[PDB]
């Protein structure tokens, strides 16, 4: 309903069942939203950082972080994480 | 005015990733600009839509005379200047 | 538990003589060391400890009477005396 435990901007049942971010607020997911380009997100309702990266579930889902981060890291289950490496020539 | 602890490196990547680069190369002078684009995949990207003509008008401060943009007195309309793109932009612009 | 910014201190002993004790410099600091892991991780090569001053601009010297027995069939030993590292906590924001 409106109970929030991990203390982000997403309620418990929304994270448990499914939610999408529109107009900077979290709303329940309806299957008719898919054809507009929206995505279904599920997170952990007892943790503020489901993946463990610096950004919380709300920041990742709403795309409220560094705009250079790839759009496939906006779901809470995928971590924003670089794999920098070095090669010699 | 404080200029210590304010780095451009924090905004270089965030700006290059949501913008298109336009370079106007006049005689004995060069200009480079970044104009914000819009992502049509994301439904929550409310950035205003622009065409290349409006982007060129905004970036370099050109003023229309009879529907054709002039920089100061130099014609910059597509029929009076030479446009050069890379392979990706050429492919993305030939189909549109 | 993991240890961040591992900075061990080691001794080098030839026969009964401690040649030098060197603390890890910025070249030989491991940022991450999870339990059961190793630095460098398995599959990589060992890291070279070949400097003795604070800024890594001075090599480790040995005596002539030490090198003589070093090349005469005697080996050196390494003993770790202490290790200093860090641990992670959450601040007032959530980082
Ligand atoms: Ca929550
Ligand atoms: Ca959560």
From TrEMBL, chain A:
Residue numbers binding Ca(2+) 1: 4, 6, 8, 10, 12, 15
Residues annotated as binding Ca(2+) 2: 6, 8, 15, 44, 47, 57
UniProt name for this protein: ADP-ribosyltransferase binding component
Species in which this protein is naturally found: Clostridioides difficile
Gene expressing this chain: cdtB
Portion held of the full protein: 217 to 305 of 876
């Amino acid at each position: 309903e409106d109970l929030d435990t991990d203390n982000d901007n997403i309620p418990d049942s929304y994270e448990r069942n499914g939610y999408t971010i529109k107009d900077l607020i979290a709303v329940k997911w309806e299957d008719s939203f898919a054809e507009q380009g929206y995505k279904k997100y599920v997170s952990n309702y007892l943790e503020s950082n489901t993946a463990g990266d610096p950004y919380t579930d709300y920041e990742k889902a709403s795309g409220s972080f560094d705009k250079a981060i790839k759009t496939e890291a906006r779901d809470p289950l995928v971590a924003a994480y670089p794999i920098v490496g070095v090669g010699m020539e | 005015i404080v200029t210590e602890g304010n780095s451009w490196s924090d905004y270089i990547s965030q700006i290059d990733s949501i913008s298109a680069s336009i370079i106007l190369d006049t005689e004995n002078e060069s200009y480079e600009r970044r104009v914000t684009a819009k992502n049509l995949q994301d439904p929550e990207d409310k950035t205003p839509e622009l065409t290349i003509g409006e982007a060129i008008e905004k970036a370099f401060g050109a003023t229309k005379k009879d529907g054709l943009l002039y920089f100061n007195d130099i014609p910059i309309d597509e029929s009076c200047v030479e446009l050069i793109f890379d392979d990706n932009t050429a492919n993305k612009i030939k189909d549109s | 538990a993991p240890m961040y910014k591992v900075t061990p201190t080691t001794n080098l002993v030839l026969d009964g003589d401690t040649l030098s004790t060197i603390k890890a410099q910025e070249n030989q600091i491991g940022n991450n060391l999870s339990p059961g892991d190793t630095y460098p991780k398995k599959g990589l090569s060992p890291l070279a400890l070949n400097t003795m001053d604070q800024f890594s601009s001075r090599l480790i010297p040995i005596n002539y009477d030490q090198l003589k027995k070093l090349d005469a069939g005697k080996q050196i030993k390494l003993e770790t005396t202490q290790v200093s590292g860090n641990f992670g906590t959450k601040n007032s924001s959530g980082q």
